[PDB]
Symmetry: C2
């Protein structure tokens, strides 16, 4: 798609087909995140691709929204992408947590790239973070910044991405696994 058309088409999607994500399209979305700007070109975040239904259920239960729409989007999509950061990598710059800025930038590349590849997303930032860390086996010194479902909507210094992309569990390589 054309760039401005991607910006215009992006919306928060809560209803998804069960259609499987194309692996090549997913890896292009992650590549778009890998190409995001960051402070001092440090990359204080990694992404966990969550495909296990049991883990979706854990994430759904952890979400703290007024309505169940976000929880259901996670239940009812083929996968969820979770953005996890290390606050100590770059620390604070002029009174601001750099990790929040840099991880937000990269996650918007995920979101816009999904839209470009014909997939819906929905920013989710409100959750019991401890519960998500327990589900995904994330060390407690890291921060869960945001997550999003990924699916087809219902009609209604070159980084090696392999170091930055996990499947279901923190530390388990997406690209090296029989996923």
């Amino acid at each position: 798609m054309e760039f401005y058309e991607v910006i215009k088409k992006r919306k928060s999607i809560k209803k998804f087909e069960q259609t499987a994500i194309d692996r090549d399209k997913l890896l292009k979305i992650i590549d778009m995140a890998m190409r995001a700007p960051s402070w001092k070109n440090k990359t204080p975040y990694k992404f966990i691709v969550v495909e296990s239904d049991k883990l979706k259920l854990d994430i759904a239960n952890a979400i703290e929204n007024k309505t169940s729409a976000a929880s259901e989007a996670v239940l009812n999509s083929p996968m969820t992408i979770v953005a996890v950061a290390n606050p100590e990598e770059s620390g604070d710059v002029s009174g601001k947590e750099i990790y929040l800025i840099d991880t937000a930038i990269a996650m918007e590349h995920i979101v816009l790239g999904a839209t470009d590849e014909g997939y819906g997303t929905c920013w989710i930032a409100a959750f019991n973070e401890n519960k998500i860390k327990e589900a995904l086996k994330i060390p407690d010194n890291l921060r869960v910044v945001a997550l999003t479902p990924l699916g087809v909507p219902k009609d209604s210094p070159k980084k090696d991405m392999d170091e930055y992309l996990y499947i279901d569990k923190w530390g388990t390589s997406f690209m090296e696994s029989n996923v």
Copy 2:
């Protein structure tokens, strides 16, 4: 330009031509920011377009980088875009300052939009925030999140309420 091509083409630019920014392209870039997602669709930020050379010099002097490259990018481009946020509008969600997340999202829409439109940018986050608030007459309870030069490299919200010229509160649109 194709979406993926903009992503790949984006780079930090430090050297610029003097060429004036096209107004219509600038407003298209801000529009792209207006369409950014945010928590509860609140918009805790606004943008100051800085065109005054005196103010560019104030900003250049406020930047706190090891090298002078960023300072010079602000001096030698036709304008700089400054993102200013209100922490108290949405506050914190799950131990995180929503304003930083949301402002960063929208600033990346201006960075990418700039690239789409043929202009370079450079994220600048390290500065004497007080000096920039002084220069741009920003109330002290707000935060300067980031800024970027905008220029040609060498070699349903109404954006009117979210876009200022040179000084906080002075409408870009409604000004000559």
